[PDB]
Design an enzyme around this catalytic site. Structure first.
Site, PDB file in Angstrom:
ATOM      1  CB  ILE B  21       7.211 -17.704  -9.239  1.00 25.84           C
ATOM      2  CG1 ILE B  21       5.842 -18.009  -8.643  1.00 25.84           C
ATOM      3  CG2 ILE B  21       7.005 -17.145 -10.369  1.00 25.84           C
ATOM      4  CD1 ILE B  21       4.772 -16.884  -8.348  1.00 25.84           C
ATOM      5  CE1 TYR B  26      -3.482 -27.042  -5.258  1.00 24.89           C
ATOM      6  CE2 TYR B  26      -4.471 -26.608  -3.022  1.00 24.89           C
ATOM      7  CZ  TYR B  26      -4.439 -26.506  -4.600  1.00 24.89           C
ATOM      8  OH  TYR B  26      -5.403 -25.558  -5.197  1.00 24.89           O
ATOM      9  CE  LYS B  44      -1.862 -22.935  -5.851  1.00 22.54           C
ATOM     10  NZ  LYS B  44      -2.056 -23.052  -4.492  1.00 22.54           N
ATOM     11  CG  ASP B 107       8.562 -13.967  -2.255  1.00 16.94           C
ATOM     12  OD1 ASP B 107       9.070 -13.391  -3.155  1.00 16.94           O
ATOM     13  OD2 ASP B 107       9.003 -15.189  -1.759  1.00 16.94           O
ATOM     14  CG  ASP B 147       0.969 -23.571   4.705  1.00 12.35           C
ATOM     15  OD1 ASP B 147       1.853 -23.330   5.673  1.00 12.35           O
ATOM     16  OD2 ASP B 147       1.229 -23.718   3.428  1.00 12.35           O
TER      17      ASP B 147
HETATM   18  C1  LIG Z   1      -1.675 -19.786  -4.066  1.00 10.58           C
HETATM   19  N1  LIG Z   1      -1.318 -18.313  -4.874  1.00 10.58           N
HETATM   20  C2  LIG Z   1      -0.071 -17.880  -4.925  1.00 10.58           C
HETATM   21  C3  LIG Z   1      -0.037 -16.495  -5.558  1.00 10.58           C
HETATM   22  N2  LIG Z   1       0.888 -15.424  -5.702  1.00 10.58           N
HETATM   23  C4  LIG Z   1       0.408 -14.447  -6.415  1.00 10.58           C
HETATM   24  N3  LIG Z   1       1.711 -13.807  -6.428  1.00 10.58           N
HETATM   25  C5  LIG Z   1       2.586 -14.640  -6.073  1.00 10.58           C
HETATM   26  C6  LIG Z   1       3.963 -14.312  -5.732  1.00 10.58           C
HETATM   27  N4  LIG Z   1       4.797 -13.193  -6.681  1.00 10.58           N
HETATM   28  C7  LIG Z   1       5.779 -12.684  -5.876  1.00 10.58           C
HETATM   29  C8  LIG Z   1       6.897 -13.227  -6.468  1.00 10.58           C
HETATM   30  N5  LIG Z   1       7.833 -13.811  -5.921  1.00 10.58           N
HETATM   31  C9  LIG Z   1       8.866 -14.387  -6.765  1.00 10.58           C
HETATM   32  C10 LIG Z   1       9.845 -15.109  -6.544  1.00 10.58           C
HETATM   33  C11 LIG Z   1      10.845 -15.539  -7.694  1.00 10.58           C
HETATM   34 CL1  LIG Z   1      12.166 -16.420  -7.581  1.00 10.58          CL
HETATM   35  C12 LIG Z   1      10.232 -15.379  -9.133  1.00 10.58           C
HETATM   36 CL2  LIG Z   1      11.075 -15.973 -10.305  1.00 10.58          CL
HETATM   37  C13 LIG Z   1       8.970 -14.703  -9.411  1.00 10.58           C
HETATM   38  C14 LIG Z   1       8.409 -14.185  -8.018  1.00 10.58           C
HETATM   39  N6  LIG Z   1       7.355 -13.513  -7.814  1.00 10.58           N
HETATM   40  N7  LIG Z   1       4.805 -15.363  -5.256  1.00 10.58           N
HETATM   41  C15 LIG Z   1       4.291 -16.209  -4.934  1.00 10.58           C
HETATM   42  N8  LIG Z   1       4.910 -17.206  -4.210  1.00 10.58           N
HETATM   43  C16 LIG Z   1       4.826 -18.468  -4.318  1.00 10.58           C
HETATM   44  C17 LIG Z   1       5.621 -19.504  -3.508  1.00 10.58           C
HETATM   45  O1  LIG Z   1       6.988 -19.240  -2.975  1.00 10.58           O
HETATM   46  C18 LIG Z   1       7.203 -17.787  -3.297  1.00 10.58           C
HETATM   47  C19 LIG Z   1       6.359 -16.781  -3.375  1.00 10.58           C
HETATM   48  N9  LIG Z   1       2.920 -16.480  -4.852  1.00 10.58           N
HETATM   49  C20 LIG Z   1       2.239 -15.527  -5.404  1.00 10.58           C
HETATM   50  C21 LIG Z   1      -1.563 -16.407  -5.652  1.00 10.58           C
HETATM   51  N10 LIG Z   1      -2.157 -17.647  -5.125  1.00 10.58           N
END
Ligand SMILES: Cn1cc(-n2cnc3c(NCc4nc5cc(Cl)c(Cl)cc5[nH]4)nc(N4CCOCC4)nc32)cn1
Lengths: 826, 330, 248
Positions: B21, B26, B44, B107, B147
């Site tokens: 995603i 890191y 992750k 996000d 961050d």
């Molecule tokens: C370290 N850590 C991370 C999380 N964590 C939990 N939930 C999400 C989440 N959920 C929304 C979401 N955005 C998305 C964008 C796409 Cl393109 C796709 Cl395919 C599926 C998506 N889902 N997004 C993210 N991001 C990681 C990096 O860049 C963008 C967002 N981290 C998340 C928990 N701990």
């Protein structure tokens, strides 16, 4: 890295603005028509318009106004682009050499500011003391028209009213005064402020604020004889000037929304108005002069003149002729008669200027089997909806097939020698409880007709409440012959059912070629539609037959044929259906990690998914496992408008911010994540809104093969009628044309002194990136038009290092031949 | 209360990987669903293959800091799973571990970068209050999320906000000063003290980043956008004023003060250039974007602000999503 | 939610080491040997006292789940100190800890590290993290000994003698299973209780409630004197076995 090449096949045809003045000379009456990034200059004659000059600008023309300050012989032109590039231009002609001089230039973008809802507005003081710009909420930018302001520096005056609808410079005021309609929680009101160049702030306005209609649209600056302003709305027209207040509310203007305005009489007695249904109105200002020598307003009157094209801008030329500038249909020159004809219309059409309008969908088909190919587009909207048959012939030959309703998607079925067209018409709730169409269209004038009798959604016991006068969309599937373009059949879908996708193909072991439509049940309460159908039709012997229907729980935004299987996207889900031997659809596998799966493209077993905000995703069917599997996705967020597959490793997409980009597999398999990372290797600000990508080419092919330096051909249609072509290059050819562009930019003089690299830079409200991986073919093909001294200046010291050899120096004539070969791809 | 406590013993076989995603602090974040529960989780972690120090210490920090923090506005680490481990052959075992987080609907970065979502004043109030309540909780525990970015700010469709990546998070102590990395926050959200080379920085580094986010919700464009640290300090000086000993007594103490001087000694134009922002928020923005970190407001003071003090967590206002404008506007 | 890390004294007779034929005296010796091994090595490395105890707590908990016969004591203790350094932000390289261990260990004892001393330790890190269930945050009686002494007001020299003497008892209690039997707050009170009896100090006089003879209750609630006497009896058993006398 990837390398691509984009050329314009058809320039933008939709008129975004039109003004009348004396720009070329102080004697001539000029009509400056503004299309996207294009400026057309005409001279008004007794028979029509005489073209004199057309220039291209490195920016989308947003504001275009003619003004004449004290000490100028003829009118000057002010143009502000969408990227906030401002400039002042002058016409200069020394015999046969016609050139446009950039008097001033500058960028008026602010570092901080919320872009307004009603868009960029540009107004000029009647005394030509300043240029008023509304670029951000709560900020009014003033460019003082001083002789020393060649850099067009400007200051911002704080504006209490954040949400402004429209603003104009008032006439007859001692100090420069603006009049604007703003919207606060208490409705909409009209207010006035005085602009002070000395104090650089607002003072109290001349006349007080009044509570106006909640749907106030436009402000009309009434000239000196009457003074004040006129406010146009949806149901009422109001005149405000000091203590004088007049308000007319004719019942005719309530039927359709008024969108444009123009002044006919310089005294301000008559004004032109136009609605969304193409009707042309005349706003009459009756004069009552008081035994004191002054000319107050007796009353206001509105009279219907006739029907024109749904116009974005109206402009009155002298002697009773009016230019109807249309964005949704063909632009027109109309004659206004004093006497009505036998039908009661005072309007008669003179000439018709072809406008491809909004090209929502299009398909390349060799109808006449000439190996050339023709492009059939769904063009226009509402009464101006039509089909366009385009062929290369040196000018394009275009045949128009009027539909008089809004076309949606088109597909070709050679087995039936006919096209499949999804269309929608507007009907109004009548007194009978049903609906009544405003005008007959293709769906109503079909030879044979049928209506879906489906009972899938007939589970609602209580039908939603309908009030009289509410517009409704009626969706139909049109069967149109490929030779006569006659509406052979029209299938009307269910009530509140929208046609979104259309495909023609055979499936499974079924030899019959079918028309398949993906639909959606749209209700106003819906927080995204949750009902839909995939319906299979077979056109046989002049009758469309309902073969089967499959109920889905969402909107079928797009469908495509996949290895004899039906790939359909339903809201966030991407589903693959199998066509059983019982002539019914069966689900095989699904993918859900999407927001709104909109655009789908396939090549082999790979699938390109275009999401609302996830950009592009690569999906693999994998026949062994029988389930989808994510391959790689573009992680930079983009709002997609159309996707396309270039080759097995490159993908092409279009953004809502008029930007094209190209993703590719990283091509280095170190970590499995590098493979899963689609790397954006191409960036390019196109300036147009791409709706449909289509593989194919309209050029005549007489067995010529591989003789082109370019490989591949992708056509696309845009909202402004522009049709372009994308193609890939080798690294040798890319560096040759790219190095040439940098030489041409230093040589070619741009209108308004706009940097070409700034114009083609990827641009959203949040990001600004330089163009990469794309060759602006419109700039390369301009090498055949610059003078000979400029040609040799570009080719001087130019060495090409294509590889498998050493940097050979380029000749001037060798480059002229190469571009002539590049001009043959379109 | 020990069934959910037993960690590291479960395998990644119970999770089916949907796909990747995005890129985290890191490592890259992937998405998966548990076979048993059917719940979407965020996955992750890292690898244990680099035997230079075995288990990564930056990962150990994120595990220690996150297991202590529990709040409605903080992403809760669900569990930790491993690859298939060989029985009796634990010496040849080269398997990696995976951190299991809670998955959110969207996000903040993707929503704003696309330009689809719209934030009203009440939406921003629901956003900022939840953001500061969690930040005050973690700042109360003396931890610094070095961050703060739009990609690490997660939201559900209900309107609840949570912070995500704590891999770049360390512990803060006012008494004992430990030198830290001067570059740690994304350049567009980096506080001015880190640009000038402060190695021992205060928890006010997160307040500055969220301040740039507060203004970014009103303009729909990031406040300071530069590619170089000096150019970033210049844009900060044009708005918040140039770093000067008058408004920042210890600005001389910072090493790069004599090195990185702006073109001129610009005056603060924050209230002028943000005249379209409501007064309740503009006063908050002025305090959050204060040059001197000792004069910059804390996380609790933002919750006791006229913009956020009276905000109710019951009126959770989710961001407006377009409906049929996604296919064709109106 | 969080795992339980406390057993009863009666449960120690069923450790994996005990059930493999090891007698109670040998395992207690192996614990004291391993504890000072973590203590002496980390002290040579100049480590903080919280880092030393963190590895010792990992060490004590590890051999509640595993046997001393199956896992070498000094190889495990080295792995505990290596992990404890990264936890408490006092990191050391694995090669530096092995170097210190070989200096203070004879050839026989260092032979537990095998042909590759670093790898035999680095491998055990996976098993250590799984055994401790990734519960890295560990609290120690040191911070409570100081937090409670700060609330004491009176003779500065008498209070400081109480602190150092109790602090000495905390270092000695790491050699025992007390770390597994009771929470660190009770241990910090018990070492104050023991140092108070030896120095004949009436700690209640230095408290905010000078007549509250059960002074510890305002510090740690629900602690009977039976627990304090049990802890004091175990701490002094270390001194009486080695014949050494109270620090005093
Ligand atoms: C370290 N850590 C991370 C999380 N964590 C939990 N939930 C999400 C989440 N959920 C929304 C979401 N955005 C998305 C964008 C796409 Cl393109 C796709 Cl395919 C599926 C998506 N889902 N997004 C993210 N991001 C990681 C990096 O860049 C963008 C967002 N981290 C998340 C928990 N701990």
């Amino acid at each position: 890295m990837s390398y691509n090449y984009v050329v314009t096949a058809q320039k933008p045809t939709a008129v975004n603005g039109c003004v009348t003045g004396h720009f070329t000379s102080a004697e001539d009456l000029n009509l400056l028509i503004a299309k996207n990034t294009r400026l057309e200059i005409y001279v008004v004659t007794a028979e029509g318009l005489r073209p004199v000059k057309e220039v291209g600008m490195y920016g989308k023309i947003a504001v275009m106004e003619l003004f004449r300050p004290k000490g100028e012989s003829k009118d000057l032109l002010f143009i502000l682009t969408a990227k906030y590039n401002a400039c002042i231009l002058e016409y200069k002609q020394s015999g046969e050499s016609i050139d446009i001089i950039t008097r001033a230039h500058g960028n008026v973008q602010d570092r901080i500011g919320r872009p307004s809802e009603t868009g960029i507005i540009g107004i000029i003081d009647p005394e030509c003391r300043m240029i008023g710009l509304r670029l951000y909420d709560g900020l009014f930018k003033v460019i003082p028209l001083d002789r020393d302001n060649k850099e067009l520096k400007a200051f911002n005056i704080r504006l209490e009213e954040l949400h402004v609808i429209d603003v104009k410079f008032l006439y007859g005021c001692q100090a420069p005064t603006i009049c604007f309609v703003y919207q606060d929680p208490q409705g909409r009101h009209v207010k006035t402020y005085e602009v002070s160049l000395r104090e650089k702030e607002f003072n109290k306005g001349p006349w007080k604020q009044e509570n106006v209609e909640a749907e106030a649209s436009m402000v009309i600056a009434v000239p000196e004889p009457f003074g004040g302003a006129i406010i146009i709305g949806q149901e009422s027209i109001t005149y405000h000037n000091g203590d004088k207040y007049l308000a007319i509310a004719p019942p005719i203007i309530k039927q359709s929304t008024i969108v444009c305005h123009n002044r006919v009489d310089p005294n301000g007695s008559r004004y032109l108005l136009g609605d969304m249904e193409g009707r042309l109105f005349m706003l009459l200002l009756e004069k009552e002069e008081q035994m004191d020598g002054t000319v107050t307003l007796k009353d206001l009157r509105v009279e219907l003149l006739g029907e024109t094209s749904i116009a974005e801008c109206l402009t009155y030329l002298d002697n009773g002729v009016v230019f109807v500038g249309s964005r949704l249909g063909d632009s027109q020159l109309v004659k206004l008669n004093v006497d009505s004809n036998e039908q009661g219309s005072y309007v008669v059409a003179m000439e018709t200027f072809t406008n491809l309008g909004p090209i929502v969908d299009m398909c390349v088909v060799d109808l006449e089997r000439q190996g050339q190919g023709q492009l059939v587009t769904c063009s226009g909207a509402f009464k101006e909806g039509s089909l366009r048959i385009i062929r290369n012939g040196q000018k394009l030959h275009i045949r128009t097939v009027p539909l008089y309703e809004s076309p949606r998607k088109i597909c070709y079925q050679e087995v039936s020698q006919c096209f499949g067209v999804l269309s929608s018409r507007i009907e109004v709730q009548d007194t009978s409880g049903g609906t009544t169409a405003l005008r007959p269209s293709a769906s109503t004038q079909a030879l044979s007709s049928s209506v879906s009798s489906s009972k899938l959604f007939s589970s609602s016991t209580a039908p939603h409440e309908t009030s009289f006068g509410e517009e409704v969309e009626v969706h139909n599937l049109l069967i149109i012959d490929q030779h006569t373009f006659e509406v052979l059949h029209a299938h009307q879908f269910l009530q509140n059912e929208y046609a979104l996708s259309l495909v023609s193909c055979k499936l499974g072991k079924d030899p019959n070629t079918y028309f398949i439509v993906g639909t959606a049940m749209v209700y106003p309460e819906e927080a995204e539609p949750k009902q839909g159908r995939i319906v299979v039709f077979q056109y046989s012997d002049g009758k469309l037959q309902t073969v089967a229907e499959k109920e889905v729980k969402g909107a079928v935004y797009s469908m495509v044929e996949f290895n004899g299987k039906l790939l359909a996207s339903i809201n966030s889900t991407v589903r693959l259906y199998e066509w059983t031997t019982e002539k019914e659809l069966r689900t095989e596998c699904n993918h859900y990690n999407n927001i709104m799966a909109l655009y789908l493209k396939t090549k082999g077993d790979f699938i390109l998914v275009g999401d609302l905000m996830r950009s592009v995703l690569l999906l693999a069917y994998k026949p062994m496992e029988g389930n989808f599997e994510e391959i790689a996705r573009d992680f930079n967020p983009n709002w997609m408008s159309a996707v396309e597959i270039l080759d097995d490793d490159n993908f092409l997409g279009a953004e809502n911010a008029f930007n094209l980009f190209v993703c590719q597999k990283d091509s280095a398999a170190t970590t499995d994540e590098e493979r899963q990372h689609l790397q954006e290797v191409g960036l390019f600000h196109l300036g147009e809104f791409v709706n449909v990508f289509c593989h194919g080419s309209l050029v005549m092919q007489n067995l010529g093969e591989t003789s082109t330096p370019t490989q591949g051909s992708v056509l696309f249609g845009t909202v402004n009628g522009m049709i372009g072509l994308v193609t890939s290059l080798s690294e040798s050819w890319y560096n040759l044309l790219l190095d040439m562009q940098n030489r041409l930019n230093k040589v070619i003089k741009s209108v308004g002194k706009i940097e070409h690299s700034f114009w083609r830079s990827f641009h959203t409200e949040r990001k600004t990136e330089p163009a990469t991986g794309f060759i602006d073919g419109d700039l390369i093909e301009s090498f055949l038009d610059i003078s000979r001294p400029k040609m040799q200046e570009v080719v001087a010291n130019l060495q090409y290092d294509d590889g498998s050899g050493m940097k050979r120096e380029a000749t001037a004539d060798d480059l002229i031949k190469v571009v002539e070969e590049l001009t043959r791809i379109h | 209360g020990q069934t959910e406590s037993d960690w590291g013993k479960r395998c990644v076989d119970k999770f089916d990987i949907i796909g990747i995603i995005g890129e985290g602090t890191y490592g890259q974040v992937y998405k998966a669903k548990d076979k048993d529960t059917g719940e979407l989780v965020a996955l992750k972690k890292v690898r244990l293959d680099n035997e230079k120090e075995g288990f990564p210490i930056t990962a150990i920090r994120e595990i220690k800091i996150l297991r202590q923090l529990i709040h409605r506005s903080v992403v809760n680490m669900k569990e930790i799973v491993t690859d298939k481990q060989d029985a009796l052959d634990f010496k040849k075992d080269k398997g990696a571990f995976y951190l299991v987080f809670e998955y959110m609907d969207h996000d903040l970065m993707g929503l704003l970068e696309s330009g689809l979502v719209h934030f009203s004043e009440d939406h921003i109030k629901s956003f900022m209050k939840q953001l500061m309540e969690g930040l005050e909780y973690c700042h109360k525990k003396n931890f610094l999320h070095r961050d703060i970015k739009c990609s690490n700010i997660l939201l559900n469709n209900s309107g609840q906000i949570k912070l995500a990546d704590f891999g770049l998070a360390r512990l803060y102590n006012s008494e004992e000063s430990r030198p830290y990395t001067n570059k740690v926050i994304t350049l567009w959200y980096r506080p001015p003290e880190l640009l000038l080379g402060e190695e021992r920085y205060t928890p006010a580094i997160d307040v500055w980043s969220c301040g740039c986010i507060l203004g970014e919700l009103f303009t729909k464009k990031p406040i300071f956008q530069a590619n170089l640290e000096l150019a970033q300090l210049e844009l900060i000086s044009r708005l918040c004023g140039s770093p000067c000993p008058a408004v920042w007594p210890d600005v001389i103490k910072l090493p790069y003060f004599n090195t990185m001087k702006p073109k001129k000694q610009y005056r603060r134009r924050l209230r002028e250039e943000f005249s379209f922002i409501p007064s309740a928020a503009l006063d908050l923005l002025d305090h959050m974007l204060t040059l001197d970190p000792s004069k910059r407001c804390t996380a609790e003071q933002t919750l006791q602000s006229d913009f956020l003090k009276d905000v109710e967590l019951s009126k959770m206002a989710p961001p407006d999503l377009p409906h049929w404008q996604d296919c064709h506007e109106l | 939610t969080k795992p339980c890390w406390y057993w009863d004294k009666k449960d120690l007779a069923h450790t994996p080491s005990q059930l493999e034929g090891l007698d109670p005296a040998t395992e207690a010796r192996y614990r004291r040997e391993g504890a000072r091994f973590i203590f002496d090595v980390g002290t040579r490395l100049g480590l903080h006292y919280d880092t030393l105890a963190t590895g010792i707590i990992y060490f004590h908990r590890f051999y509640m789940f595993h046997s001393f016969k199956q896992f070498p004591r000094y190889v495990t203790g080295a792995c505990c100190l290596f992990l404890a350094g990264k936890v408490e932000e006092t990191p050391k390289k694995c090669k530096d800890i092995i170097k210190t261990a070989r200096s203070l260990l004879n050839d026989v004892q260092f032979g537990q590290f095998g042909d590759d001393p670093k790898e035999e330790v680095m491998v055990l890190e996976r098993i250590l993290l799984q055994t401790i269930k990734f519960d890295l945050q560990v609290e120690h009686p040191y911070q409570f000994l100081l937090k409670y002494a700060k609330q004491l007001k009176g003779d500065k020299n008498k209070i400081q003698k109480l602190v150092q003497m109790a602090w000495t008892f905390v270092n000695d209690s790491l050699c025992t299973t007390l770390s597994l039997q009771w929470e660190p707050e009770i241990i910090a009170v018990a070492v104050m209780y023991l140092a108070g009896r030896l120095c004949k100090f009436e700690i209640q006089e230095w408290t905010s409630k000078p007549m509250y003879r059960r002074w510890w209750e305002q510090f740690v609630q629900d602690v009977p004197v039976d627990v304090l006497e049990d802890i004091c009896h175990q701490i002094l058993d270390l001194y009486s076995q080695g014949k050494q006398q109270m620090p005093h």
